[PDB]
Amino acid sequence: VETFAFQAEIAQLMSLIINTFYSNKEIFLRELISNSSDALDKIRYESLTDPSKLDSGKELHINLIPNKQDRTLTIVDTGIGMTKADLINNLGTIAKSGTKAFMEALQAGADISMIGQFGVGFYSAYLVAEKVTVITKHNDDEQYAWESSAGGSFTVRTDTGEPMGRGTKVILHLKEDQTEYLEERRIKEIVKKHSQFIGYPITLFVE
Numbered sequence: 001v002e003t004f005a006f007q008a009e010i011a012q013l014m015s016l017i018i019n020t021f022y023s024n025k026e027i028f029l030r031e032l033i034s035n036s037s038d039a040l041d042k043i044r045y046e047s048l049t050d051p052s053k054l055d056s057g058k059e060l061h062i063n064l065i066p067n068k069q070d071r072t073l074t075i076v077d078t079g080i081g082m083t084k085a086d087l088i089n090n091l092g093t094i095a096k097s098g099t100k101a102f103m104e105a106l107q108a109g110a111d112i113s114m115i116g117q118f119g120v121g122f123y124s125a126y127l128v129a130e131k132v133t134v135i136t137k138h139n140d141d142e143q144y145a146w147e148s149s150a151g152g153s154f155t156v157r158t159d160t161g162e163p164m165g166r167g168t169k170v171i172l173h174l175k176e177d178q179t180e181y182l183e184e185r186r187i188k189e190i191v192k193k194h195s196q197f198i199g200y201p202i203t204l205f206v207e
Ligand SMILES: O=C1OCC/C=C/CC/C=C/C(=N/OCC(=O)N2CCCCC2)Cc2c(Cl)c(O)cc(O)c21
Pocket: 032, 033, 034, 035, 036, 038, 039, 040, 042, 077, 079, 080, 081, 082, 086, 087, 088, 091, 092, 095, 122, 134, 136, 146, 167, 168, 170
């Protein structure tokens, strides 16, 4: 297991998301579904020029899996996934400009729900989660687990859990007072409100 420090501005964004008083937390689900949709668009796009990219799985979909016993909400997609370099470096690098644009916009009157307009909507997960684990598999690399409870650092390790073929699984370890996002009717409401036109099937698993 390797420990990395977030780029400073990203550590600052996560402190802001964690510490700002902001009741409209439900948007985190829209943002992560949107990220899954964008990851699915990428492998679909690349597959048109190279059909061998779907050898790791043709199905393009999103599953929502709540688990009251683990207090986890898991978003699973079969999109393009992330390499080790993606996890540690690339996405963080890309997110620098968006994080700065976002912080400035919040200075000028925007609110937290607008985060996804800046390409950094993943960090809205920390509105509801004390810890986030991401398992991912990209066609060009092995399976990895990334994890952070914020505080300025994250870790990455090889994952030898059940193999996933290709894609990303985001595991939201929910804060004690956010267990409403484990409820079936709450999840349906929010998907209906915010993610009505996503062009992949979203399956809400029940308990
Ligand atoms: O694999 C994913 O994107 C790969 C293709 C890129 C698509 C554009 C949408 C952005 C998505 C993401 N931005 O990450 C922000 C980030 O630095 N870190 C650290 C590494 C762990 C993931 C979060 C990662 C991602 C997220 Cl977050 C997701 O909820 C679903 C996903 O399928 C993917």
